[PDB]
Design an enzyme around this catalytic site. Structure first.
Site, mmCIF file in Angstrom:
data_model
loop_
_atom_site.group_PDB
_atom_site.id
_atom_site.type_symbol
_atom_site.label_atom_id
_atom_site.label_comp_id
_atom_site.label_asym_id
_atom_site.label_seq_id
_atom_site.Cartn_x
_atom_site.Cartn_y
_atom_site.Cartn_z
ATOM 1 N N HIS A 133 0.805 -1.217 0.000
ATOM 2 C CA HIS A 133 0.000 0.000 0.000
ATOM 3 C C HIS A 133 0.841 1.272 0.000
ATOM 4 C CE1 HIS A 133 -3.670 -2.253 0.516
ATOM 5 N NE2 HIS A 133 -3.323 -2.725 1.700
ATOM 6 N N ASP A 171 -2.357 -10.909 -1.889
ATOM 7 C CA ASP A 171 -2.992 -10.335 -0.704
ATOM 8 C C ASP A 171 -4.435 -9.986 -1.088
ATOM 9 O OD1 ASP A 171 -3.672 -7.775 0.944
ATOM 10 O OD2 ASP A 171 -1.878 -8.534 1.949
ATOM 11 N N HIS A 173 -6.139 -7.461 -0.481
ATOM 12 C CA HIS A 173 -6.285 -6.039 -0.803
ATOM 13 C C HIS A 173 -5.523 -5.686 -2.065
ATOM 14 C CE1 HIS A 173 -6.821 -6.320 3.621
ATOM 15 N NE2 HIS A 173 -7.874 -5.573 3.322
ATOM 16 N N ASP A 264 -4.159 -12.781 3.835
ATOM 17 C CA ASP A 264 -5.441 -12.309 4.331
ATOM 18 C C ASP A 264 -6.621 -12.723 3.470
ATOM 19 O OD1 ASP A 264 -4.411 -10.475 2.467
ATOM 20 O OD2 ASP A 264 -4.579 -8.721 3.863
HETATM 21 C C1 LIG Z 1 -12.406 -0.549 7.941
HETATM 22 N N1 LIG Z 1 -12.076 -1.917 7.616
HETATM 23 C C2 LIG Z 1 -11.128 -1.920 6.490
HETATM 24 C C3 LIG Z 1 -9.834 -1.198 6.868
HETATM 25 C C4 LIG Z 1 -9.440 -1.631 8.231
HETATM 26 C C5 LIG Z 1 -10.241 -2.261 9.127
HETATM 27 C C6 LIG Z 1 -9.470 -2.545 10.286
HETATM 28 C C7 LIG Z 1 -9.730 -3.170 11.508
HETATM 29 C C8 LIG Z 1 -8.700 -3.257 12.413
HETATM 30 C C9 LIG Z 1 -7.445 -2.718 12.152
HETATM 31 C C10 LIG Z 1 -7.164 -2.114 10.962
HETATM 32 C C11 LIG Z 1 -8.188 -2.044 10.027
HETATM 33 N N2 LIG Z 1 -8.197 -1.489 8.767
HETATM 34 C C12 LIG Z 1 -7.075 -0.915 8.039
HETATM 35 C C13 LIG Z 1 -6.301 -1.972 7.274
HETATM 36 C C14 LIG Z 1 -5.271 -1.531 6.466
HETATM 37 C C15 LIG Z 1 -4.490 -2.424 5.772
HETATM 38 C C16 LIG Z 1 -4.743 -3.780 5.837
HETATM 39 C C17 LIG Z 1 -3.760 -4.648 5.130
HETATM 40 O O1 LIG Z 1 -2.598 -4.258 4.886
HETATM 41 N N3 LIG Z 1 -4.144 -5.898 4.964
HETATM 42 O O2 LIG Z 1 -3.275 -6.825 4.431
HETATM 43 C C18 LIG Z 1 -5.781 -4.237 6.635
HETATM 44 C C19 LIG Z 1 -6.563 -3.335 7.334
HETATM 45 C C20 LIG Z 1 -11.642 -2.626 8.824
HETATM 46 K K LIG Z 2 -3.783 -8.167 -4.165
HETATM 47 ZN ZN LIG Z 3 -4.018 -7.071 2.838
#
Ligand SMILES: CN1CCc2c(c3ccccc3n2Cc2ccc(C(=O)NO)cc2)C1
Ligand SMILES: [K+]
Ligand SMILES: [Zn+2]
Ligand SMILES: [K+]
Ligand SMILES: [K+]
Ligand code: NA
Length: 354
Positions: A133, A171, A173, A264
């Site tokens: 990201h 991932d 995301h 994830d």
């Molecule tokens: C609002 N939802 C989406 C975003 C979010 C949520 C969340 C819950 C706990 C901690 C971070 C969190 N985030 C930020 C978040 C940012 C990045 C990632 C990530 O890098 N995943 O691989 C995962 C979560 C839930």
């Molecule tokens: K991806």
């Molecule tokens: Zn992710």
């Protein structure tokens, strides 16, 4: 015929001082490393040392202002760490964060170097904080510097500017930072599979949709495979690899494959909501090993269920070591729609899709 592995417990030092239960836990990497020991994979790998990335290496992808701002956090008091972290979307910072981000990137450079100098065939990097990201000029989503993007540029810096690097980002995301860094580049093919939900899923941008195919000389070199309509699992990921990832990758003929290997999308992840199994990740890895004469570097990104990520990444390493793939439904309708949208978007650029 050797697999490299990099892990350094110093990367555990980055932590959330306000919420010790935040899911991007120090224990993510130690749990994965322990599982590799338990499964007797660690003793089968060549250990590659971690090192710090240099600031000049960070400048391959990041602005001097961004590098210096993150570096300035090393001596900040808590209030100032909170204020700085809050300038970004979804970042926490401790005094150890900058060092840990440097170690994650330098570990990956050493692994890429080991592959490209013929010391190992392939490698796995058990690193945090994650990278995909992070943008040229900002941190985002737990990521400070874009480890995978930097590793592609580092590889080009020790071979040639036009070295063909495939980045497959599985991932859950979208790797918005990686897409942006390479958007005009035909030397780096970025392929991301990600939950999208028409923009409802983090990082909440239409940049992740299938119609973002690259720009200028990079047109055709950005492949987004966006999922809509809830839980996806092994059938959908296998189909995306069969119809999209592998045909495009073979046509591109990469000289190095980097995997932005978040876990994830795994069964059990509280944030991803998907059902990819450890055996599924093994099959994806085994397919990618058919590219680039086997020159594959698997780089940890996200993944928040400690048991799920430990089993999943370990299965990937087992594949890299040459173990036989483990034994593995019709697709969800919306997954067929997604795959067909990507096929239509990319058929102008890739003959293999026609
Ligand atoms: C609002 N939802 C989406 C975003 C979010 C949520 C969340 C819950 C706990 C901690 C971070 C969190 N985030 C930020 C978040 C940012 C990045 C990632 C990530 O890098 N995943 O691989 C995962 C979560 C839930
Ligand atoms: K991806
Ligand atoms: Zn992710
Ligand atoms: K690209
Ligand atoms: K299009
Ligand atoms: Na070096």
């Amino acid at each position: 015929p050797i697999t490299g592995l990099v892990y350094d417990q110093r990367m555990m030092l980055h932590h959330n001082m306000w919420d010790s239960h935040h899911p991007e836990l120090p224990q993510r990497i130690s749990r994965i490393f322990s599982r590799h020991e338990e499964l007797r994979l660690l003793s089968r790998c060549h250990r590659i040392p971690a090192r710090l990335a240099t600031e000049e290496e960070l400048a391959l992808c990041h602005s001097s202002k961004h590098i210096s701002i993150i570096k300035s956090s090393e001596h900040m008091k808590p209030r100032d760490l909170n204020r700085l972290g809050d300038e970004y979307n979804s970042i926490f910072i401790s005094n150890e964060s900058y060092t840990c981000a440097l170690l994650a990137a330098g570990s990956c450079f050493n692994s890429a170097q080991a592959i490209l100098t013929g010391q190992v065939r392939n490698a796995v990097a058990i690193v945090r904080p994650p990278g995909h990201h992070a943008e040229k000029d900002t941190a985002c989503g737990f990521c400070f510097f874009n480890t995978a993007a930097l590793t592609a540029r580092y590889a080009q810096s020790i071979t040639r500017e036009s070295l063909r690097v495939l980045i497959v980002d599985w991932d859950v995301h979208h790797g918005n930072g990686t897409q942006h860094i390479f958007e005009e580049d035909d030397s780096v093919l970025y392929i991301s599979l990600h939950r999208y939900e028409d923009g409802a899923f983090f990082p909440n941008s239409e940049d992740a949709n299938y119609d973002k195919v690259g720009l200028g000389k990079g047109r055709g070199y950005n492949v987004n495979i966006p999922w809509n309509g809830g839980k996806m699992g092994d059938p959908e990921y296998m189909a995306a690899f069969h119809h999209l990832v592998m045909p495009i990758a073979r046509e591109f003929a990469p000289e190095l494959v980097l995997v932005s290997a978040g876990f994830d999308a795994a069964r059990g992840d509280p944030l991803g909501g998907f059902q990819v199994t450890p055996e599924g990740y093994a099959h994806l890895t085994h397919q990618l090993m058919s590219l680039a004469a086997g020159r594959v570097l698997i780089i940890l990104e996200g993944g928040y269920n400690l048991t799920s990520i430990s089993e999943s990444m370990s299965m990937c390493t087992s594949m890299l070591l040459g173990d036989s793939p483990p034994s593995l439904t019709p697709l969800k309708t919306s997954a067929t729609v997604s795959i067909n949208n990507v096929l239509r978007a990319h058929a102008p650029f890739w003959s293999s899709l026609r």
